[PDB]
């Protein structure tokens, strides 16, 4: 479970990244596709997977919006992300083993832009946060 300390750290990060959020999502997605090419199968309808392509920019915005919802719903991610869970299970059927990949690429992306926020205790909170989001998205698989 997330502690009140973890939730505070997550909320404080989300505040700081506002001007750069849409670029963070697009870059993180660009990272997933190139670094873990097994994920490309889910997006084989984008001809340009570079982080400045129109489809990747525009889907990076959507991801960051789904994460802004997770932040809003941080007290009960399981109830809060239920529709997104059913989507990724039943419309898209995404191997839920890919969630940890995307979380990692978001952390990496955040690190390159905001390195001073990556203290070890801050990193621990952020990782606990992305783990809980992934477990929430995994809820409706079975």
């Amino acid at each position: 479970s997330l502690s009140s300390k973890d939730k505070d750290a997550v909320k404080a990060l989300w505040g700081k990244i506002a001007d750069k959020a849409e670029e963070i999502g697009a870059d993180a997605l660009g990272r997933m596709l190139a670094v873990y090419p097994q994920t490309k199968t889910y997006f084989s309808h984008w001809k340009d997977l570079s982080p400045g392509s129109a489809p990747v920019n525009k889907h990076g915005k959507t991801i960051m919006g789904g994460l802004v919802d997770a932040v809003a719903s941080i007290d009960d991610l399981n109830a809060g992300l239920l529709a997104l869970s059913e989507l990724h299970a039943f419309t898209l059927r995404v191997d839920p083993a890919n969630f940890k990949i995307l979380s990692h690429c978001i952390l990496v992306q955040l690190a390159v832009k905001f390195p001073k926020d990556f203290t070890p205790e801050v990193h621990l909170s952020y990782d606990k946060f992305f783990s809980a989001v992934a477990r929430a998205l995994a809820e409706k698989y079975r």
Binding site: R31, A34, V108, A111, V112, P115, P120, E121, L124
Partner: protein
């Protein structure tokens, strides 16, 4: 594995930019704090039930530096990593019984320490080459079935 020219030059260039002691100590400390169960493998490195204690623990710093030099060994033998890591794999499997998931936790912590140091120069394409190298390393460090 087969390395492209770009992959080969990127790996050598990343490592040429790292303080092995700074990066290695930060990396091992990060792993022990973010994934605290990894502490149990290190029951001979002093006190570890506290972030401040992990952060200033000299043995943790020393062993972090050892890991980076162990990785530097793979950088100098890019086409012979399996044999290079033959004895380390035995150590980490047969003597230490390190669950292989732990190799991925540590690798992920290195990646994030490296990303924070290198900044916008750690692009998706650089990270791709870096991750291929850590997958090769982790594969050769795990139990060898073949």
């Amino acid at each position: 594995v087969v390395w492209t020219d770009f992959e080969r030059a990127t790996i050598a260039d990343i490592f040429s930019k790292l303080d092995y002691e700074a990066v290695g100590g930060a990396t091992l400390a990060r792993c022990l704090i973010v994934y605290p169960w990894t502490q149990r493998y290190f029951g001979n490195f002093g006190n570890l039930y506290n972030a401040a204690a992990i952060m200033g623990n000299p043995m943790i710093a020393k062993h972090g530096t050892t890991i980076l030099h162990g990785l530097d060994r793979a950088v100098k033998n890019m086409d012979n990593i399996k044999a290079t890591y033959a004895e380390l794999s035995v150590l980490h499997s047969e003597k230490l019984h390190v669950d292989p998931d732990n190799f991925k936790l540590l690798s992920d912590c290195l990646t994030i320490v490296v990303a924070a140091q290198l900044g916008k120069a750690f692009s998706g394409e650089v990270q791709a080459a870096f991750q291929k190298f850590l997958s090769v390393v982790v594969s050769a460090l795990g139990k060898q079935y073949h």
